Symmetry: C3
Subunit: 114 residues, 3 copies
């Protein structure tokens, strides 16, 4: 914070996503329902793209669900991870990769703004 998305890194050159970590240690329980985890990373995104925030497989399998997040091209706020403990108590340590940011083309349409 405030760090732009150009600071994020990829696990490998073939990686679809840029890695995202929480900036805090947090405990999640099933009865808590959706929590927004802070990353300290901020939009905006490169021209003509939007972002999709998704979980990592290994973290999903440990029972932390990441709800899909959509980041608009011109969003300048903080990117947060919407997360929920599925079945059991989950502990998120500062610095553990929890989610990934995937960049996709923004297709132009004639739909009206309103």
């Amino acid at each position: 914070q405030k760090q732009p998305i150009s600071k994020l890194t990829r696990a490998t050159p073939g990686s679809a996503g840029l890695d995202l970590c929480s900036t805090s240690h947090t405990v999640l329980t099933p009865e808590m329902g959706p929590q927004a985890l802070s990353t300290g990373i901020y939009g905006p995104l490169p021209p003509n793209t939007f972002g999709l925030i998704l979980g990592r497989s290994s973290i999903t399998m440990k029972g932390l669900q990441v709800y899909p997040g959509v980041i608009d091209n011109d969003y300048t706020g903080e990117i947060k991870i919407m997360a929920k403990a599925v079945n059991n108590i989950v502990t998120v340590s500062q610095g553990n990769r929890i989610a990934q940011l995937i960049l996709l083309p923004l297709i132009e349409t004639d739909n009206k703004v309103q």
Copy 2:
């Protein structure tokens, strides 16, 4: 209904998604499991694209989960939102934006139809 996707609007010019609302007031509880909410909006989609239906962040955080929906290019039926109340009772009012339609390129492959 029957309204085509060209009638949908974007929240802002930088918005990735086109907004979707339910046409009914509905109450959802956790024990109900997935429900298909009617939008009154119908495919098909623009040439060489498919649709992805996702939740909005603010609605996700109020404990209404939208399951990712895939809309094929040539689907002409009604777009519905697959939704579930996570932890608590959720009330959906007619007209409240619940989900978004994101348009993505349809990549061509040589995979067989069958």
Copy 3:
């Protein structure tokens, strides 16, 4: 197994996704939490693309949730479906289409690997 993604088929020419089935009969219950279902299909993906694994609508509505899976371009391991029974006991029969693989462009950025 080991079958490449070129062996998968589409339901119809307009289908966004390539169909994925589990190679085993498996029962899932809500208390089990995320399970990785084997498909016997392996990466890698076509050049300049990544994969997104998502649920099918009809299966989502029968109470089997597929968590979004991201397949990197150069992944050569087995594609697995991360799945959970939502509310009730779900039975997956060998050969029933449970998920779909969607191919998307891999956008190039200057982000560092690390």
